[PDB]
Amino acid sequence: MRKEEIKQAALTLFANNGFEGTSLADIAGVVGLKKQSIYSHFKDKDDLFLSIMKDAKSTEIDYYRAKLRDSDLSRPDLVLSSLLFGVKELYDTDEAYQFWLRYGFYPPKHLYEVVQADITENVLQMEHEFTDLFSNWMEQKLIPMQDVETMKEAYMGILDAVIVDIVYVNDPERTEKKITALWQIFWRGITLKALNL
Amino acid sequence: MRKEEIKQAALTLFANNGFEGTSLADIAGVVGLKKQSIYSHFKDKDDLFLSIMKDAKSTEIDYYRAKLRDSDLSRPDLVLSSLLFGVKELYDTDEAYQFWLRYGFYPPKHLYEVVQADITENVLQMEHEFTDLFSNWMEQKLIPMQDVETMKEAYMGILDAVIVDIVYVNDPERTEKKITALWQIFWRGITLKALNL
């Protein structure tokens, strides 16, 4: 559809040229239209940007949910390490996720509150998913009993460190080393064991 | 002096209003001057911005060095936790550090390379400081002998997670909780009684 062609053209231009650098005339020209036709489908440039942000929001949370629900939940070490490396692979391959992570670090100022609500909605969903999963793993005696909130806060903090690296550092070697080190120390801290035996 | 009065006024305005939001006429008006006086001391607005950035670079590395050299080095847990909580306290109380952290996440595009060089220089200095300090603590038997690069990567990663929280979350209770959780799991992972023997 034309609406989705407009969103795809805007996504590319926004992700590569920034918000202020991207005009509706630019977007319309990519799809072969005039500016007036974009208003047939979106209220203004803010609405177009926020419509793409809403799609990208779903991209992120659907990915986390697949990683935390569709994997082998008897292996917490694989589940949680796979999600850390996974966000790196999703950033490499999904243009909407790139858009999401990059604009999370610098949203248009007049849209900050709406973008913040999108991010917050996903963080709360992640917090609930981690809290329930970590509790189940402790009851199953797969990891030592310990404060669930601490484990969730530390894991989401390590996710933040990985996300900063992927967005600001263009070096897959430096990123792989950083994720591996964070994972190794985190998992030692959670399991209070140096290796499973 | 007038030059340091101009830099102080520009520091505040840049840190609170952004690069484009801040004009030389704005800066001059704060100090009771006209624009011509700013060019008596700076080549242009970029030069003024980068001069503040160079001062802020020194603010950061001097603080890290004080926390890692002037504390009780027989207590690694106090030294490293004090630096994690400390960056938060420095951001709350030092305008140059606020400027440094905020513009690190979004530098003026045409000044990206020079700002990146400032940040990179400090990161390399921190890497060397941690590598030497961590090795010394292991030789002194204050923490278990283990891979130093892993410990350095993990600690600098948790510093990154804390800095994201400090800049993007304006809730001191949430930030305190995040730092505490990251520190507790990191320290458990580093100090594992299973690492020994």
- Report DSSP letters for A71-88, one per residue: S-TT-HHHHHHHHHHHHH
Closest C-alpha to A107, from B42, B54, B14, B106:
B106
Handedness of CA B175, B181, B182, B183 (dihedral sign): positive
3-state secondary structure at position A19: coil
Structure tokens at B90: 């420095």
Residue A137 burial (CB count, 10 A): 21
* Cβ-nearest to B153 among A153, A178, A192: A178
Residue B69 burial (CB count, 10 A): 11
Provide the shortest C-alpha distance from residue A34 to chain B (in Å): 30
User: Phi and psi at residue B194, in whole multiples of 5°?
Assistant: -80, -25
Closest C-alpha to B109, from B173, B60, B150, B49:
B49
Range of the domain at B27: 1-197
Residue A106 burial (CB count, 10 A): 13
- Is A181 close to B157, i.e. CB distance below 8 A? yes
- d(Cα B114, Cα B185) in Å, to the nearest integer? 36
With beta carbons under 8 A apart, name residues in chain A contacting B192: 188, 192-194
Is residue A9 within 8 A of residue A30, CB to CB? The reply is yes
Cβ-based burial of B172 (10 A; exposed 0-12, middle 13-18, buried ≥19):
exposed
- d(Cα A57, Cα B9) in Å, to the nearest integer? 39
Structure tokens at B84: 């994690």
- d(Cα B165, Cα A161) in Å, to the nearest integer? 10
Residues of B with CB under 8 A from a CB of A: 105-106, 149-151, 153-154, 157-158, 160-162, 164-165, 177-178, 180-182, 184-190, 192, 194-195
Structure tokens at A21: 């650098």
- d(Cα B88, Cα B20) in Å, to the nearest integer? 27
Handedness of CA A46, A49, A55, A58 (dihedral sign): negative
* Cα dihedral: B157, B189, A141, A122 (round 10): -10
Residue type, A116: Q
What's the total number of domains in chain A?
Answer: 1
- d(Cα A42, Cα A9) in Å, to the nearest integer? 14
**Reported resolution, Å:** 1.7
- d(Cα A179, Cα A163) in Å, to the nearest integer? 10
* Cα dihedral: B106, B129, B65, B189 (round 10): 80
Closest C-alpha to B127, from B104, B147, B156, B154:
B156
- d(Cα B112, Cα B121) in Å, to the nearest integer? 14
